[PDB]
Symmetry: C3
Subunit: 205 residues, 3 copies
């Protein structure tokens, strides 16, 4: 089976199985392992790997999409002695996650979000982009091949294609998404399409 | 099955199944979905995903290769109201495609070509490279980690490793492939090898 | 089966099957083909592809990990006329390999090491990083999105995130891993975790 429990290890005493909304579509060639929650109308495409086997949940909010070859994984959040590693946990609305993906988020082909990380609602994470140890705000755009490592990206900003942002001083001066910006409407279109693809693929299973 | 029809959606009234030349080899761990044409002697490796579920064909010409982890996908080419979105369609020799991959093209491991896009004959698309909203000419070389977004790359040019080309002014001044250039013979060698691998893998199936 | 022999071709007269230590865990959604040796306690994650079908061995040493979506492959090491192509072979301790991955090495999600290449013991190859025609020394760190092409990286150096190193003059001036460097202890932690995950996954198979 491609939907599986995580294994017992010294940093995971109890196996968890994924919690998947009945309206989500998980492609038979995707892999989803461990403590993962997947929301309504989510589409998970071929060759994606969502793997939560180091403690703490990976959460994927409603109407989000995880496209082909995307990887979601996270650093250990509980060490061998049962002690939570706080640096490796993100807090969102009073709850703790290893990776939090909000609602209406697009994780486009071959991107990767590696915990600890949070991605706010209505954000587009572009093809081959990378997010690690970062909080990306709502209504953001990571263009293809951009990356955010160790930073907070404020709401409504975009990172130009290929730019690797590693310092908060850079993240603070990112340009704003405006109506005339080339990717300002991209995520809404991708979400609309993927919500419809998820329902169409569900009707073939 | 790993070779599948696309689903019915408001931008796809009729499911299509892939058309695959009998001499092509599709690895059992690759995924090929929807309106896709694959030419003669093509090799499709493990973990590649070719997904044509948003309208319009993805075409992969003869003696081309789609290596491990490569993704081919495309933006919607017909909106909900049946109206073709012309910006998202490329024209090649009088026919319309979402993605056109020519003959003798190598899409090397983990690269991605996302429609609208066309890649001309005898071109090498290097490892982890990215092509989106671009036309790449014949006899080109995209070195590993290069990218072409929103541009036309003239015939016989190469993009140095890591360079992300987003403006036509840059694409126009790319260097030329000459006989002494390190990758000038790479594609011919890769095509020769992959045509032979496809036949060898076919003899094990 | 996801563990398979390579095919017969003019540059491979005899099929080889992988040699895998009984303590290694190969995920059912990984692919391992051909002349590959995998050492003790190695973890191979979903969607990884290790493909040795062009001649010469790919070796993965003990306690190493090959994470989700990683690709290992190599250029031809024997031409059609039986003649070894010496440029495409690396020598390690008196033996020849197409790709050599040492002991305690982490190949993190979506990275790629393409032969000819060697990676020394206790080295971390970061997420989405790329190594090709290079020798990476022991105790090195390739940060996420870095790349080494055509160079030798001395022992104990790191390549900052996003940096693409293509000339020996650059590789010679890379900074040194010191105790205060942010990734100085990353590999030891990742190895420890992955050795334990491999044993936990083995207990579920
Ligand atoms: Zn990880
Ligand atoms: Zn797409
Ligand atoms: Zn290769």
């Amino acid at each position: 089976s491609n939907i599986r429990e995580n294994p017992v290890t010294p940093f995971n005493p109890e196996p968890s199985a994924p919690v998947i909304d009945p309206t989500a579509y998980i492609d038979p060639q995707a892999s989803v392992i461990g403590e993962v929650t997947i929301g309504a109308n989510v589409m998970v495409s071929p060759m994606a790997s969502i793997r939560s086997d180091e403690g703490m949940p990976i959460f994927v909010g409603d109407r989000s999409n995880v496209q082909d070859g995307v990887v979601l994984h996270a650093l250990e959040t509980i060490n061998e002695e049962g002690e939570p590693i706080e640096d490796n946990i993100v807090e969102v609305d009073g709850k703790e996650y290893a990776v939090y993906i909000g609602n209406n988020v697009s994780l486009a082909h071959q991107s990767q979000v590696h915990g600890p990380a949070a991605v706010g609602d209505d954000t587009f994470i572009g093809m081959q982009a990378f997010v690690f140890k970062s909080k990306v705000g709502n209504n953001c755009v990571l263009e293809p091949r951009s990356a955010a490592i160790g930073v907070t990206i404020p709401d409504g900003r975009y990172i130009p294609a290929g730019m690797v942002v590693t310092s908060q001083a850079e993240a603070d001066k990112l340009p704003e998404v405006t109506d005339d910006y080339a990717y300002s409407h991209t995520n809404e279109a991708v979400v609309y399409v993927n919500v419809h693809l998820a329902e169409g693929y569900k009707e073939t299973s």
